[PDB]
RNA sequence: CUCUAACUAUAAAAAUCUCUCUUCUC
RNA sequence: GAAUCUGGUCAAACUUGGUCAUUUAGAGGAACUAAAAGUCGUAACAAGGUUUCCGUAGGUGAACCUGCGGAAGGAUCAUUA
RNA sequence: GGAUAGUGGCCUACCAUGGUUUCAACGGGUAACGGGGAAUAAGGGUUCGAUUCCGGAGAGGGAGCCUGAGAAACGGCUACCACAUCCAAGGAAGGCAGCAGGCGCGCAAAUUACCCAAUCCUAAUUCAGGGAGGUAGUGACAAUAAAUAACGAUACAGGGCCCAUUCGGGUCUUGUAAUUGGAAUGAGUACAAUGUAAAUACCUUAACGAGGAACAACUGGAGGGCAAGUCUGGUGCCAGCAGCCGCGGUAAUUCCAGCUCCAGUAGCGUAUAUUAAAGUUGUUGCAGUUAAAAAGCUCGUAGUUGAACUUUGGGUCUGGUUGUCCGGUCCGACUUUAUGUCGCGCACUGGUUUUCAACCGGAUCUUUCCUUCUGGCUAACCUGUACUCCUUGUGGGUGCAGGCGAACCAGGACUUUUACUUUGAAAAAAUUAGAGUGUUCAAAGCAGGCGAAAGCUCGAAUAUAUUAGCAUGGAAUAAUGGAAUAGGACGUUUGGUUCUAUUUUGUUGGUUUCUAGGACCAUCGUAAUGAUUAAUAGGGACGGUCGGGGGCAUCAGUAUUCAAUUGUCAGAGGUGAAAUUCUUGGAUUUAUUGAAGACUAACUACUGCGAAAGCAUUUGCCAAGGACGUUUUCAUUAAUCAAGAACGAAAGUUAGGGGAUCGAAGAUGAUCAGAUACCGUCGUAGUCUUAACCAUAAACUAUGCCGACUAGGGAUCGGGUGGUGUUUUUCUUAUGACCCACUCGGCACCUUACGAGAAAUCAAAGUCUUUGGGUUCUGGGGGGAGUAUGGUCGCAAGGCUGAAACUUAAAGGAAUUG
């Protein structure tokens, strides 16, 4: 209930189930998962939908569960994990996005200041990942590089 | 955000004694805890308690009976030296016929007294009596 | 819980807050600052000798009516000049114009005691001898 | 043990004041 | 092997300005205190007799007045009358 | 390279452009020499440390140097500057912050004394010398013990009284009286002697030395704080007292005196400084709603802090320490003695497996490792070789090849690193603590004690310093690191490589061997081959939403003010009341309309959105956001934040646009004693905008943010679940709209104290003397004052930062009665 840049106070999110193990009634197999993941990241899909496609067409509860190894990992392990990860390439997509709002439009301040916290979360997101050294110690946030980065 | 959980613990502990109930639920339930409520157990302060796995840093619950009247911690570990353990007794413990330092030496999480004996000394958790 | 932090690493901010705190008291101040020094009539000083310039007598606050016998003394130390209290009943006699008297403190760390305006300082000794020893005549003014 | 009704609506001007305050124990 | 003497070297110190710091006067100016039996008003404390106060701007013997936004520390916690 | 005794930018030559810093560098101040320590004292601390010891520096300020082992010496020289001295005017000589003493300064500090007796030191060395030093002189800096009377016998009295005929003996004692006696003793003098280098002085002691024992004790106070007077006289808000409150105005418990009394007492009073009081510096341990004090809000580097998780159990043996039950040992009641006896329920020392119970360890078994080998050394018996000393008995051995290494060495080998904590070596003496010790006691000192008096002796103990360093045992808490491209770990693997070199073939030079020794490189297998959860922490994806969030562009509404046309006709505005003003050129109203600019009524609420300002006509576009749903994804990415930044009401400032209303200035008409104020009519700037500034508000919930818990009652907004629910109508159903129940989040609200506050009151202002979840900012009585100055921002207005001198005993908060 936190709201790291904004004043809110939600708790809305999911409770995992207590049995790490498969569920009783599921029949597919786990290499057919897998196959399932890797076609849907062939077809150009970020993990997050992955996992949605699978929850909702198909009987998948979670990839750990079944697998045994999450959905970034499986496609890491097969090599289609994308050079920047998915959160930080989204927070990219909508700063670009306020950006060009903002260059069509001069007079709109909220959206400066959007902009402004959407960026503070850039920095955060990519000194985290910078550490982990998922990306290079080079890299960082300018304009016209979201916009490459993003095209 | 949750900085000392042991904190919380004892905080819950002594709002659920304050207002007369017999037991507590601690969520976020870590060793610390764990080995103080078996101290305060081990000396008679509290009563029954239990740890509830979630595969989520599991809780506890806490039976009490009425017979402990304040926990607390010491939110700095101090590294408290042999020589100021009966100084932190004073300055917290109520009288020196009882009462117990609950601190944490190299020898595990033990009472002031207990410690005392194995003439050792470490950081100091918190204080109960 | 409180204002101040209480990290085991927090030493440095907790010193620091300090030492800006103490700027506000008043005697921590003034003794840092040397304000006794630089601005106080005597620095540092207990008693200090001067030169009586002329014999006036200032008139008491609102609920004391009374004309309380001062003199005015330009202090030889330094070259200040300072209104000072002669502390008796038959005391103003006493002392006489152009003489060496040797003030002491008021003893209201140097601010007005009583009804007296403007005034910080008594009168222990004059030309070498003690207005007290004076007052019960035991011993007499040389009047050099 | 059963219910939602009645209603108003005046403003003229008017400044100032000197002393002196005094114990509560079976 | 003395005086003397060539070049350095350590360099005190002198002259000349420059700079800063502390004392140091200084025509005059703007103040603030304390003293409350001066004077002109009576702003505030009650609805202080124009409710009060804040920010900002203008004005005027003086407190203060006015304009525009606020706030109740308001004189209302209240119109499903 | 030079110089140095020697390392060293210490200096030179040539290169490189580097080194420190928000963990405060650099600069400035220090009425700063550092330390051992001193004062103060519940604990934590605050202040001081020029000076008896250790270091450093200096000899008026500066530089330079000879001699030596050692000096940049100064009671050694050279020169300059400052200050000076004798002078025969040519010259010469200076260094007290050494002991004395003087001038000056200032509130502030000693005698031109004796002497090498004691401590030592220098020298050729006992002997000489030493203002080092000791002794005395002054010395109320501080510190120790302590005189100023003690006891009778008498008169004036009081209490326990034998009872109570009034009594009253005073039966039993305790004081008060210029009555009255006998004692003792010093403070002083002083034969002596001791003392001392010689003398004082002290210890001892002749002879004197107490009656008012004049051998005479003061310093402050007597309203309160604060122990002791409402006694006498004097002065009358004078004189004066009073640290503060206050007394003094003709009866002063406070001023000046006398009497009495109180406090300390050879000391007491003042002044400044400082400590405890001060929980008024608050780490322990302060407060911020209104008393002083939450930055207007949000982001954010540094700083501080940061979810849980990785062997927990057991069984045995065994070592100390306890309390156990008693053994031996024995002692208290029995008194000149004891045992038999009365047991303190054993005053010394054991069985301490008596179960017991711990309180600490040590080794052992877990798929349970504690660094392991490589030679020693094999210490030790799983060795079995020759065998058995002795009862046929594994009790017990003489002992040699394997072979036990933690019983220990001394060597290669790898060492995750810390923070933490136990122990030890260390932290000079003096000081603090503290043991022993009759300096006559004590401050002290390190002395002393015991013989028969015939030399015999125990001492000169200990602890602490909390930081830095060194060693050591521990492994909870806190942090970092492994294996994700396997470049991971092991092995008799099996292959190759630079080598390295013991010996060996004498030695020396190479060639290869061999043996043994690191890796660089493949390949071969052994293995459970290797990735903790997904926080009722966070970010992100998705879903339907929700909102007066924001921007741009459009749309409408009446209203207002003008204008056009039309209608009639004396008034219309406005006010407490009037007047200014407009009106038969027909105003005010009357109908259509038109123009402009602003605004978004009623719906509008203890309702919504937003970080705060703020946001309210319709529609479209633009992007954004909270909340909920989620068996989606990453796995600590987080909380608060110095530096830095974005927005920031109204007002105000530059320009361009507009220009309706309302209205700072101004113009007046009233009201008044005045009214250039409030009431009224006009009325520029402004209000409305596009750019650029401004950064302040009672920017208020006067309540910082994040996190947890604690108590009952309803409603309300957004979302989501269920109802055998109700109307809806599209025949039924699906929606929607309600009804009931639940849940999450939000603005809120009622009751209550069982909690908190000085209360008003707060469901947080609670979980705070039973004081510690993380974290930022601010306040230390009022005024001066948010002023001056110095920065910095601004065109300007002004914003941010921001004292002191001085003055004051209150200012202030809440509530109670008038
Ligand atoms: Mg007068
Ligand atoms: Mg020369
Ligand atoms: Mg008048
Ligand atoms: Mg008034
Ligand atoms: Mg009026
Ligand atoms: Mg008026
Ligand atoms: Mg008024
Ligand atoms: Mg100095
Ligand atoms: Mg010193
Ligand atoms: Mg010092
Ligand atoms: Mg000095
Ligand atoms: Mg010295
Ligand atoms: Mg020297
Ligand atoms: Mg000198
Ligand atoms: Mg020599
Ligand atoms: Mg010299
Ligand atoms: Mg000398
Ligand atoms: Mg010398
Ligand atoms: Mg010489
Ligand atoms: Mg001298
Ligand atoms: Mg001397
Ligand atoms: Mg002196
Ligand atoms: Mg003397
Ligand atoms: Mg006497
Ligand atoms: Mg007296
Ligand atoms: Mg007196
Ligand atoms: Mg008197
Ligand atoms: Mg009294
Ligand atoms: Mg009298
Ligand atoms: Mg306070
Ligand atoms: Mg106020
Ligand atoms: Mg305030
Ligand atoms: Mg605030
Ligand atoms: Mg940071
Ligand atoms: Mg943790
Ligand atoms: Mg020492
Ligand atoms: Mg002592
Ligand atoms: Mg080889
Ligand atoms: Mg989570
Ligand atoms: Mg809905
Ligand atoms: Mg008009
Ligand atoms: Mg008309
Ligand atoms: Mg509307
Ligand atoms: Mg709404
Ligand atoms: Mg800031
Ligand atoms: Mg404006
Ligand atoms: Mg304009
Ligand atoms: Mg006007
Ligand atoms: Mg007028
Ligand atoms: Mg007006
Ligand atoms: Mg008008
Ligand atoms: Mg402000
Ligand atoms: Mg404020
Ligand atoms: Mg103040
Ligand atoms: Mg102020
Ligand atoms: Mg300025
Ligand atoms: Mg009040």
């Known amino acids: ?151 | 955000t949750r900085t000392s959980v042991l904190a919380d613990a004892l905080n819950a502990i002594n709002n659920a004694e304050k207002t007369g109930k017999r037991q507590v639920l601690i969520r976020p339930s870590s060793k610390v805890i764990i080995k103080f409520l078996q101290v305060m157990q081990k000396h008679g302060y509290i009563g029954e308690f239990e740890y509830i796995d979630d595969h989520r840093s599991g809780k506890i619950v806490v039976q009490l009976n009425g017979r402990l009247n304040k926990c607390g911690v010491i939110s700095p570990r101090f590294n408290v030296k042999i020589a100021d353990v009966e100084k932190w007794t004073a300055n917290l413990l109520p009288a020196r016929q009882f009462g117990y330092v609950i601190l944490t030496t190299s020898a595990g999480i033990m009472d002031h007294e207990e410690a005392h004996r194995k003439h050792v000394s470490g950081k100091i958790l918190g204080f109960v009596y | 819980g409180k204002g101040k932090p209480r990290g085991l690493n927090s030493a440095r901010k907790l010193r620091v807050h300090r030492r800006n705190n103490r700027w506000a008291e008043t005697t921590y101040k003034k003794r840092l600052l040397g304000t006794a020094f630089k601005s106080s009539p005597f620095g540092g000083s207990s008693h200090a000798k001067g030169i009586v310039l002329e014999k006036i007598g200032i008139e008491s606050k609102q609920p004391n009516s009374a004309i309380r016998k001062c003199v005015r003394v330009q202090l030889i130390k330094n070259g200040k000049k300072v209104t000072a209290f002669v502390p008796n009943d038959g005391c103003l006699n006493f002392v006489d114009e152009n003489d060496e008297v040797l003030l002491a403190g008021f003893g209201r760390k140097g601010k007005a005691k009583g009804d007296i305006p403007g005034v910080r300082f008594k009168v222990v000794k004059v030309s070498g001898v003690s207005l007290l020893a004076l007052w019960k005549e035991k011993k007499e003014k040389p009047r050099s």
């Open chain 1, 1 to 151: 209930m936190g709201r790291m840049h904004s004043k809110g106070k939600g708790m809305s999110s999911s409770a995992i189930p207590y049995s790490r193990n498969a569920p009783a009634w599921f029949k597919g197999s786990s290499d057919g998962v897998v196959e399932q993941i890797i076609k849907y990241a062939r077809k150009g899909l970020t993990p997050s939908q992955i996992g949605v496609l699978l929850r909702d067409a198909h009987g998948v509860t979670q990839a750990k569960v079944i697998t045994g190894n999450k959905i970034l990992r499986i496609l890491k392990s097969n090599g289609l994990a994308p050079e920047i990860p998915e959160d930080l390439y989204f927070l990219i997509k909508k700063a670009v996005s306020v950006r060009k709002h903002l260059e069509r439009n001069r007079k709109d301040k909220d959206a400066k200041f959007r902009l402004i916290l959407i960026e503070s979360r850039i920095h955060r997101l990519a000194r985290y990942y910078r550490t982990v050294s998922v990306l290079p110690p080079n890299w960082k946030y300018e304009s016209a590089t979201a916009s490459a980065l993003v095209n």
